[PDB]
């Protein structure tokens, strides 16, 4: 019905895709072809929306099904929660110019798995944590985004 445009506009879930890592690669290539940026000049930026805002910026890639195992998202700011497996609706995937700046101490590298068992590292997401929270606690609590 729409060819290329709808293939980007659709909020395809990440749990059901057969090779979602290939989907991430394809999205990266699409963003590179946009503005002819080099593939290595691109790094993933993740913002969690709600109520299906779908305010795509020609680089955002709305995805659903991601499950944050161990904490909650509060306006893209993490917070440790005892209640586990908080659903994340429409975690927009953006790619921007990597400025090679030093990431501040309020960021964490969350491994994104597909299965409930953790044996397939699709990609990594850098979230901003709450002021009181620290990376050590997140690392030891075992937080990890899960597609299924």
């Amino acid at each position: 019905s729409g060819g290329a445009k709808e293939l980007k506009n659709i909020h395809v879930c990440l749990g059901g895709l057969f090779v979602p890592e290939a989907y991430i690669t394809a999205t990266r290539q699409y963003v590179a072809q946009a503005n002819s940026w080099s593939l290595e000049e691109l790094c993933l930026e993740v913002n969690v929306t709600t109520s299906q805002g779908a305010t795509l910026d020609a680089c955002s890639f709305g995805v659903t099904g991601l499950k944050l195992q161990g904490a909650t998202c509060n306006n893209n700011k993490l917070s440790l929660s005892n209640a586990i497996s908080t659903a994340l609706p429409l975690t927009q995937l953006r790619w921007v110019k990597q400025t090679n700046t030093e990431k501040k101490a309020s960021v964490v590298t969350l491994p994104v798995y597909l299965n409930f068992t953790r044996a397939d590292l699709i990609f990594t997401v850098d979230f901003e944590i709450a002021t009181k929270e620290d990376p050590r606690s997140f690392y030891e609590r075992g937080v990890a985004v899960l597609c299924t």
Partner: protein, 50 residues
């Protein structure tokens, strides 16, 4: 972290967890009497150091 226990580790994230535990335990700070082996044990309790 690299040999011994680190040899079995395969992916980066469990290696990061191993590094976190090793640095949190294996330090000169642990010599202090009021060193927490684990913080927020059942919330109010905390494992002290003998």
């Amino acid at each position: 972290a690299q040999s011994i226990y680190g040899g079995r580790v395969d992916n980066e994230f469990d290696q990061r967890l191993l590094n976190t535990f090793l640095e949190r335990l294996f330090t000169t700070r642990s010599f202090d009497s009021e060193f927490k082996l684990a913080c927020k044990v059942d919330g109010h309790k905390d494992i002290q150091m003998p």
